[PDB]
Amino acid sequence: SQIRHYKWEVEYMFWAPNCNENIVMGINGQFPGPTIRANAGDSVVVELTNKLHTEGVVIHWHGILQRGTPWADGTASISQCAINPGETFFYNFTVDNPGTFFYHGHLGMQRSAGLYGSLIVDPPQGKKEPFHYDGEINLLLSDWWHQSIHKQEVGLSSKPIRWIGEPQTILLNGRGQFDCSIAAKYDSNLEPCKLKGSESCAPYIFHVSPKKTYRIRIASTTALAALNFAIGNHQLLVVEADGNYVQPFYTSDIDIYSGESYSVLITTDQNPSENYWVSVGTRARHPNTPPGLTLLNYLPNSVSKLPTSPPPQTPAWDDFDRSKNFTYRITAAMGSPKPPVKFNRRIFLLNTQNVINGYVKWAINDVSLALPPTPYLGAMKYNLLHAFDQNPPPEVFPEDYDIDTPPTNEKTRIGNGVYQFKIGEVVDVILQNANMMKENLSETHPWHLHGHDFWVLGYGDGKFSAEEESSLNLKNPPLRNTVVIFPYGWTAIRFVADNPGVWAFHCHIEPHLHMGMGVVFAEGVEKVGRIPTKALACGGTAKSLINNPKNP
Amino acid sequence: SQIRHYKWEVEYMFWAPNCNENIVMGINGQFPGPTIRANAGDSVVVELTNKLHTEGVVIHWHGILQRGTPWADGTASISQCAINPGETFFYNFTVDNPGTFFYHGHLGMQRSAGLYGSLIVDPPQGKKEPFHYDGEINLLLSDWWHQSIHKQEVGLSSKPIRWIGEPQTILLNGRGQFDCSIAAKYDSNLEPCKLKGSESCAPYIFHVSPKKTYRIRIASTTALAALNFAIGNHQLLVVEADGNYVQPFYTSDIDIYSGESYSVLITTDQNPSENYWVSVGTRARHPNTPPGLTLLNYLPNSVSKLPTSPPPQTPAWDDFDRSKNFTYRITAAMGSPKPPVKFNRRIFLLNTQNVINGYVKWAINDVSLALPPTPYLGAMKYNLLHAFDQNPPPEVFPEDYDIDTPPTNEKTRIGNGVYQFKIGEVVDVILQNANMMKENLSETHPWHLHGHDFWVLGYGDGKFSAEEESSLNLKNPPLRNTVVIFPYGWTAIRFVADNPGVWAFHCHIEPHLHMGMGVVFAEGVEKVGRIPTKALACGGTAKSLINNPKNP
Numbered sequence A, B: 001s002q003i004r005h006y007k008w009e010v011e012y013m014f015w016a017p018n019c020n021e022n023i024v025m026g027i028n029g030q031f032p033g034p035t036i037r038a039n040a041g042d043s044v045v046v047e048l049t050n051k052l053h054t055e056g057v058v059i060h061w062h063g064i065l066q067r068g069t070p071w072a073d074g075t076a077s078i079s080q081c082a083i084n085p086g087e088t089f090f091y092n093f094t095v096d097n098p099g100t101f102f103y104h105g106h107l108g109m110q111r112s113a114g115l116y117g118s119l120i121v122d123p124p125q126g127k128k129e130p131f132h133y134d135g136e137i138n139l140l141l142s143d144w145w146h147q148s149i150h151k152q153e154v155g156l157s158s159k160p161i162r163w164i165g166e167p168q169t170i171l172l173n174g175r176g177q178f179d180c181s182i183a184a185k186y187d188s189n190l191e192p193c194k195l196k197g198s199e200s201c202a203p204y205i206f207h208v209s210p211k212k213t214y215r216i217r218i219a220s221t222t223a224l225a226a227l228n229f230a231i232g233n234h235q236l237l238v239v240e241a242d243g244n245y246v247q248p249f250y251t252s253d254i255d256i257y258s259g260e261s262y263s264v265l266i267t268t269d270q271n272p273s274e275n276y277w278v279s280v281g282t283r284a285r286h287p288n289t290p291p292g293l294t295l296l297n298y299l300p301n302s303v304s305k306l307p308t309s310p311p312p313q314t315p316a317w318d319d320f321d322r323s324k325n326f327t328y329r330i331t332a333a334m335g336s337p338k339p340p341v342k343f344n345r346r347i348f349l350l351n352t353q354n355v356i357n358g359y360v361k362w363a364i365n366d367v368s369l370a371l372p373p374t375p376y377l378g379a380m381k382y383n384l385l386h387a388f389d390q391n392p393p394p395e396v397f398p399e400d401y402d403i404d405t406p407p408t409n410e411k412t413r414i415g416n417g418v419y420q421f422k423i424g425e426v427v428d429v430i431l432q433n434a435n436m437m438k439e440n441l442s443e444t445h446p447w448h449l450h451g452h453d454f455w456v457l458g459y460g461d462g463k464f465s466a467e468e469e470s471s472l473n474l475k476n477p478p479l480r481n482t483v484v485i486f487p488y489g490w491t492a493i494r495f496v497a498d499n500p501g502v503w504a505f506h507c508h509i510e511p512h513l514h515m516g517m518g519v520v521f522a523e524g525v526e527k528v529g530r531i532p533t534k535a536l537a538c539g540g541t542a543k544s545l546i547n548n549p550k551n552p
Ligand SMILES: *[C@@H]1O[C@H](CO)[C@@H](O)[C@H](O)[C@H]1NC(C)=O
Pocket: A045, A090, A091, A092, A532
């Protein structure tokens, strides 16, 4: 096992992701940030200096379990106090298992401004992957707004709310095109982009040789968009989902929601004299954004040799039946860990959009999360019982709640209590979707749990009821970190609370998390060891720990 | 009989349709134009003074037949030379029959710049309409882009074409809202408009008293948009269409294409304690323009009192079956003129989108119309055989043409020939739609005939064949001046060549007309009397009528 050491500075810079200049949050002058790659078993050490002028910052490693290092999770106000300007924090953690992961900002809406990058983990040195491939292509998907994130943050916190709107561009490895299309030769209404390929917004072309097999690692850090990925004329075979192996299956395209990572295999068994289209189209919301496009360039053909066909037409945004047909087909690879069969706790969380005191907020069992200035992990290790609400948050919603109609908002509160588990508890979480404030509307929401992987026991329509117990999958369920709830539906997951620390479980659409959509889980905090001083040096933790008497 | 005399000037002026300033082409300092209201059989005299600085102007009176006065049709290069800066021209014509008509610019793309207004002809002095209502409401629908018309015109003439795009705002009597909605109440994702009622973009409210019946006259002069009109909780009785009366029927909403006019009657039956929404939304093209909205305000309710329901959602833009369902009902009122049973001429017109010398043009049986600088009416009266092509234009297309494939463009040319008819011929026209340049696309095209009304004999899908004859409605066919062809279909119409003149028959979507989609019909030109000298004063007619010898 090696120690992989990175030394990084976060700083804003001018950049033009879609050839339109704005400021982006860069790491060591790069947008997207540098790739961390390691082998399972290695220690990763990142010393990060903050060089934003007035802003704190933190970096979360999405999908890394942080087992034994809960202080390195990178979530402001839950694992640590943010890192102040001009200061340096060390994130030292181990990578336990292979898979496609990524890292991103977790303080405010800093991740929509560009703070993200890939973190890939390979098998232990000497071991090999269960499947063979010749080459690898890595792809990080995100979305881009031309508006400042500091104005987006303010507009989402105003009465009337000012929603961020659909993004302007879909970004493939940090690049995209606004107001022109690289596939404009198939439709005279489209404006041709003039690009020699040397520009910051020039497509990242996938180069493949004939008759080979390639692993395409795909990860999503979209702030809002749900995407559909298809290459013209090529079957995709799914082999990996969120750092875990799934039972292989072919599909013509995959849907990917923010927080998910997949690895697909392709074989370049097509006509070798032409190049093919890669389309990343928006679904689950009425599209207002052009698709992200690039070429699968069969070498030696000139990359300017355009495909004979158009890009694959993206599937209808609202055909949720086609989306469930994909999602329900995902099962654990033969030989994967099977769940505990009985649970020790089952919690029900109702997801609603609400209007609290004029403000539109998202609530979970009528509590919209407002994170405290004291980091929960420090607060609970030092038993600071005034830092947040000690009263246990609701583990059930009312059976007279009608999920087909707008909230009444009669009892909706903002809060910051923590669900607490005992070390070793098996927990089931049933996520229940409902109608939003507008009549006859319910949306998809990706939910991601920090510091754990869970088994996806099942999905259903309407409200979960006891009749649905026998449909939950206990033989084959997939292990994931991100899961979706569909319009008016439920999704059930199970996990063992075996990892000491305080972990966020939240919706991965960033405006939703900004508006309160997430909860806090804590387990076995009695067993957490020493926390770095910098993760404690704010709020009530620094108040009790800094000895500064008076008269003494 | 009575003469209605108007003293008018057209000048560009600064104005803000949707509260965003731009320049608008206004008449006597106002946008939209002044309404002309007269009774059938009166004589309208308009002395227009062109107050533009470097441009010519013409006004066309859409729907009026120009029976006896072909020189006042107001089509530059067809009935007249355009009126030069600082000059005054007289348009004197007879309004023959009651109905809802309008007038609009007909030189270049000047109508999209705001040059249009209403022309309502009431029954003969002392006669009554064949139905009863207590009031009427006049609505003129149009659409508005934020880019210059002169930059739009250069973009459609460029190689590569810059398509003008979907309109920014739908206007209801010249007002509309952009980036905000007066119906923001029902949706947190919409922005409220901050209007007091006094503004240039504040909605024209429809004031009604309860338990009364009204005639809402609706006309379309849109450059591009096909719209659908609907009133919350109110069914519509269709009683007039294009100045003619139809067999009455009920409907929840009407589709209106550019160039069409309708009168619909409503009765204020509904609950008198509230207001109801008027919604005019986009159909037949994928929408990317919010609907135009206003209120049916039941007096004495406050106009600030919103409806309980959202606006009616516009029917799906691409449900062409629902569209045909409405379109195919329209039948002439009993008592209307039946068509000649036998025809004397039948022409077949293939509507295609082509690429001529790298330019994207529209064409009819492979000729894209380029209008000459000599006005056709003057050229043909004075028998100037060198002013245009005297070869008859193509009257049939190849029956082997695949209307489901992009055009090859092989023989597609630009030209300016004229179809000539004998004074009295009963002419049949089958308009045939086909696939455009993009694979798998055909669009709707509103066709308008000048100086005539025609009977709509029928519509069908695919290619017209002779075996189609028994479906043609010779019994009840509506009398209209505009008719749509649907994607991949034909429409057949019949009219009588009985009005001496040169008349345009074109697509009423202004960009397509700019791109060549239209043809010219001339009949009985040797029966035309004296043409006004200003209408002759350009091109070949000026050259051949100004006596200016040399040596003298
Ligand atoms: C993190 O790693 C660095 C380098 O090995 C070390 O100096 C530092 O003390 C470590 N801190 C923690 C909290 O492990």
